[PDB]
């Protein structure tokens, strides 16, 4: 990992970075997720896995560097938003300018948030029994995850 | 809405079918166990008549019928309202002595000695 330091004279110094744990359980796996047999076994709660693909300020790393396949990139990206919105990444906050401060409001606890809270309209007319307007929970990208319930998960609440 | 004639292919079994249901295409069974498991209400009148002809007026009570084509022809009419199970005789046909000691099991077996005791 190379970091640029300024003095004007500016220079970038390369530092050694920790390497991947040797001996993946499932060698010959193209993408990193599949090498460790994690194709359908991670959710937004798995911060330890997700944090590895996150920039120090909460941004997602580019697909090329991580090497993830498109299908898993989309899944990893979506869970991180849900992880961020659920307050599971307190140390990856945005780099607010020195002239700015947090919004200072109390924070409502959330989890499994598909959309950005700012831009969701209220459901004033909810509808009757076989007319109900549904409140989305979770992300459709994760429908293929392993399910340990009698029937498939209730996405629409 | 009229009576329908089922294509003959429906009643021609396949080799795997014999494996699944465990019936030999040779030495076919002799007697049916037939029980009505659905209602004749809301069904066409011809279905109502065949049910009375076969004796299946009460539901979930088994009736014994001949595995012969003429009987089979009526059974095909009400195939959807009944359950057909092959009668089995593990200990042979009942005799005069064993006529009063029989019991028909849910498995399809007519046992001729019914003791109501642990197998031991």
């Amino acid at each position: 990992l190379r970091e640029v330091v300024k003095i004007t004279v500016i220079e970038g110094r390369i530092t050694e970075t920790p390497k991947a744990t040797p001996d993946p359980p499932n060698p010959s796996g193209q993408c990193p997720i599949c090498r460790w047999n994690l194709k359908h076994k991670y959710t937004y709660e798995d911060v330890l896995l997700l944090s590895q693909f996150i920039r120090p300020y909460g941004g997602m790393l580019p697909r090329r560097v991580t090497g993830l396949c498109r299908e898993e990139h989309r899944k990893i990206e979506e869970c991180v938003k849900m992880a961020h919105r659920a307050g599971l990444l307190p140390n990856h906050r945005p780099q607010l300018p020195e002239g700015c401060l947090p919004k200072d409001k109390p924070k409502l606890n959330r989890y499994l948030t598909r959309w950005a809270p700012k831009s969701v309209k209220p459901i004033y007319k909810k509808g009757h029994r076989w007319n109900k307007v549904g409140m989305a929970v979770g992300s459709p990208l994760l429908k293929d995850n392993v399910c340990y319930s009698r029937r498939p998960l209730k996405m629409m609440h | 809405f009229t009576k329908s004639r089922i294509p003959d292919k429906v009643f021609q079994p396949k080799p795997e079918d014999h494996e699944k249901y465990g019936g030999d295409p040779q030495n076919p069974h002799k007697l049916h166990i037939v029980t009505r498991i659905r209602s004749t209400k809301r069904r066409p009148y011809w279905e109502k008549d065949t049910i009375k002809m076969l004796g299946l007026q009460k539901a979930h009570s088994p009736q014994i019928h001949k595995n012969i084509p003429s009987v089979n022809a009526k059974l095909k009419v009400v195939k959807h309202l009944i359950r057909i199970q092959p009668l089995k005789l593990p200990q042979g046909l009942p005799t005069e002595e064993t006529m009063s000691s029989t019991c028909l099991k849910s498995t399809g077996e007519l046992v001729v000695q019914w003791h109501l005791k642990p197998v031991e």
Binding site: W130, R151 | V10, F11, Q12, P13, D17, Y21, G23, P25, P28, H29, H32, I37, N67, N72, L75, K76, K79, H80, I82, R83, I84, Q85, P86
Partner: peptide, 27 residues
């Protein structure tokens, strides 16, 4: 209007019983 899970399972059961009726009527 979708069809419940109870409704689709129960019919398949009845179909399987009727499927066996086809076999026992062929001998």
């Amino acid at each position: 209007r979708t069809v419940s899970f109870q409704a689709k399972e129960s019919m398949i059961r009845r179909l399987e019983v009727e499927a066996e009726n086809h076999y026992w009527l062929s001998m």
